[PDB]
Design a binder for these strands. Structure first.
Ligand SMILES: Nc1nc2c(ncn2[C@@H]2O[C@H](COP(=O)(O)OP(=O)(O)OP(=O)(O)O)[C@@H](O)[C@H]2O)c(=O)[nH]1
Ligand SMILES: Nc1nc2c(ncn2[C@@H]2O[C@H](COP(=O)(O)OP(=O)(O)OP(=O)(O)O)[C@@H](O)[C@H]2O)c(=O)[nH]1
Ligand SMILES: Nc1ncnc2c1ncn2[C@@H]1O[C@H](COP(=O)(O)OP(=O)(O)OP(=O)(O)O)[C@@H](O)[C@H]1O
Ligand SMILES: Nc1ncnc2c1ncn2[C@@H]1O[C@H](COP(=O)(O)OP(=O)(O)OP(=O)(O)O)[C@@H](O)[C@H]1O
Ligand SMILES: [Mg+2]
Ligand SMILES: [Mg+2]
Ligand SMILES: [Zn+2]
Lengths: 346, 347
DNA sequence: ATCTGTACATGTACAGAT
DNA sequence: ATCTGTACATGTACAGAT
DNA sequence: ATCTGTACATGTACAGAT
DNA sequence: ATCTGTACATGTACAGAT
């Protein structure tokens, strides 16, 4: 039933190989250009993030997210309108981009560089997608076997302690524990040029922390290892991502929703239900169902807090209209009470 | 439990911890500073705190501290000393030339210089009453005897640090896969390994750093013994077993061949056999201690206790401990066990 | 002026003291 | 239950070195 | 500063066993 | 049907060499 859906969603080994060798060629070349030139971004390092590198990509290997992170010292941070997630950054290579380090100016140069290197690539069919305003990504479209998108995300790396707004976030104490949380919070934090001073605004990223959690998700150390037993936590994430993707293809009414909403929700569930035995593979139906119910509670209450930044409600009225949330509840309730017809279509 | 009251006696006092640590840290820091002067041969050596006090299983007074002075030693090839598994020769104006004899890094020559340096710095200390203990042959330690309120021993252990992959003899060791898991084991084995001085050119592997990690990360659940987790009694069992041996050892010289490392090794095997946190519930302290005793007894009677890291090395081989010694220790453990542990009442 | 090995600054788990 | 000393990891300031 | 080599985790594929 | 064992594939950390 749901096993058969996961069978459909499973990536093929062949497709993984072909997509990765092409993706890696392009990425490596872009990364070399950023450094083996006296560009402003000399020093950037690659950080592979998001679903393909977390092993929760579904359907096909057609979307890759790579952070190019740049270490930069000092960095005074000023919280933007108590959003929790948005900041202005303050004071060398980066002179060209300011009082205040302008996200847009810096992203613009990053983008320009990337576009130029892409023009110089003759051995692969690869263009740069038209820019989405306010978006932190430079997005590459590759062809050949298949359509493949690659999001190149510029990121500031700071080694200071995480901003105050995150103090009460990452509530993993009863699940992964205090030692894990203390150590995760000793890692650097990241700032991505998302923008709401809207053009100078940056947004926090915890993509690195999320990756660690996806690959270290059990209360037992052996969860999902070769001498442990297999959770169905990841499988539930896949099923929920797929239900939203399918609904999103059909209804433009759901444009404001994205996979990060589902990722966030399941982090909350994984915290609510820390035991590995509450995610037994034999209870895949119940587990999926309790996740659906939780997401619906989030929709009904108009409340889904950033897992890392609790004051930031991703389902605030300001970000998603009530109407949209009620529409999505209708559609989830329906699939749920009719055996998920939408899992059968293409 | 009678055993809760024993642990109450064994519990270290914060006051005593403070006083001992203030002095120990002063001495160690000064010894460590001196090691990085006048281009001594040990310049670069770094401090690694290890053993029971740093693992929080020191019992009944904070009077013995173990600190490794470890020195990164890059290009080195190892030759196993007669298939022992644990003993090696080390080979390559390098600083350590002064201890070489035909490509072979002499343990005793290097330890001798280390020792000499330490003795000199100790003479220069006027703050505190501290002498250097007479050398025990084949011991890797330079041992300091301090007296502030009371007697405190500090073992300064010279150590070579290699960053290569661990020696072959350890491949099947550290069998933590069903307990702490494969990711933990892979990562542990990416840490360096250590060589300490044990004929006179022979060195011995140390895993004191790995043992410390395991003692402080000992559960199958990540929250074992944490503030939002459940308490286990693994460390309490280790303390009771250490205490039974200590008490027996101070009364009977027949037990000179036994040491606390035997009980640490045994309990690592038990922790592997019984991985679940629920098999070390605080409420089941008696059973848990008792099963540990029974296992140790089987080790004694069958003359088999393998090094946790080096499986082919039997710490209870006939060549290391006479049968008579092992039978003597079994009778004494059997006795304590069947008569209410009277030795826990002593002194 | 700039650079750096050493020591301090900050944060918290662990476990003893209350 | 809460408070508190030691150990330990990482970040950052700086007298002395360059 | 940059690159390879090694080791093993996380995957997918499929036969034979259950 | 599911599980177990082997084979084949990629990603990732870090040592040692350059
Ligand atoms: N690794 C990583 N990728 C990110 C991050 N933020 C955004 N991205 C990528 O950038 C893409 C677009 O970012 P969004 O935040 O959706 O930005 P947008 O399209 O301007 O705006 P929305 O309509 O708000 O989605 C995402 O789909 C990811 O590929 C981040 O913090 N880390
Ligand atoms: N941290 C640490 N300390 C060690 C190590 N090996 C020995 N020591 C310390 O040095 C002391 C002496 O080591 P032993 O192996 O007992 O040497 P010995 O007593 O001469 O020899 P035995 O007769 O085999 O006991 C130990 O009790 C510890 O205090 C090691 O690998 N790491
Ligand atoms: N609004 C957001 N706030 C914070 N981080 C975000 C946000 N959107 C995306 N991210 C981060 O960027 C990564 C890439 O986002 P993306 O939208 O590609 O999804 P994904 O997690 O890779 O899943 P999929 O690509 O299959 O939909 C996420 O995994 C997450 O770490
Ligand atoms: N024979 C040995 N082989 C290998 N490592 C050993 C050996 N003896 C001791 N060690 C290591 O040296 C450390 C210090 O040894 P020591 O004899 O002080 O015991 P301990 O573990 O500190 O317990 P305690 O000192 O309270 O009896 C041990 O923790 C262990 O890591
Ligand atoms: Mg993605
Ligand atoms: Mg000791
Ligand atoms: Zn525990």
């Amino acid at each position: 039933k749901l096993k058969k859906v996961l069978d459909k969603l499973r990536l093929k080994r062949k497709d993984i190989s072909e997509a990765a060798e092409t993706v890696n060629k392009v990425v490596e070349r872009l990364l070399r250009r950023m450094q083996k030139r006296e560009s402003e971004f000399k020093g950037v390092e690659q950080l592979n993030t998001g679903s393909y590198y977390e092993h929760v990509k579904i359907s096909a290997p057609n979307e890759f997210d790579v952070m190019f992170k740049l270490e930069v010292p000092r960095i005074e941070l000023q919280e933007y309108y108590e959003t929790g997630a948005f900041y202005l950054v303050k004071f060398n290579p980066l002179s060209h981009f300011l009082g205040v380090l302008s996200a847009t100016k810096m992203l613009s140069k990053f983008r320009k560089i990337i576009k130029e290197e892409v023009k110089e690539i003759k051995d692969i069919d690869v263009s740069v997608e038209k820019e989405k305003p306010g978006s932190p990504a430079v997005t590459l479209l590759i062809r050949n076997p298949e359509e493949i998108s690659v999001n190149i995300i510029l990121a500031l790396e700071s080694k200071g302690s995480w901003p105050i707004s995150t103090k009460e976030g990452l509530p993993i104490q009863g699940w992964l524990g205090t030692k894990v949380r203390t150590n995760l919070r000793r890692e650097p934090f990241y700032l991505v040029p998302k923008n709401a001073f809207q053009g100078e605004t940056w947004r926090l990223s915890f993509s690195h922390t999320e990756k660690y959690i996806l690959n270290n998700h059990g209360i037992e150390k052996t969860c999902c290892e070769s001498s442990g037993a297999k959770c169905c936590r990841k499988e539930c994430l896949k099923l929920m991502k797929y239900l939203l993707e399918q609904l999103k293809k059909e209804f433009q009414e759901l444009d404001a929703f994205c996979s990060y909403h589902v990722k966030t929700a399941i982090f909350h569930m994984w915290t609510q239900d820390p035991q590995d035995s509450q995610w037994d593979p034999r209870n895949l139906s119940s587990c999926f169902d309790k996740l659906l119910a939780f997401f619906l509670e989030c929709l009904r209450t108009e409340k889904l807090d950033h897992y890392f930044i609790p004051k930031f409600n991703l389902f605030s009225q300001e970000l998603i209209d009530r109407k949209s949330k009620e529409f999505l509840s209708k559609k989830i309730e329906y699939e749920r009470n009719n055996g998920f017809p939408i899992f059968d279509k293409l």
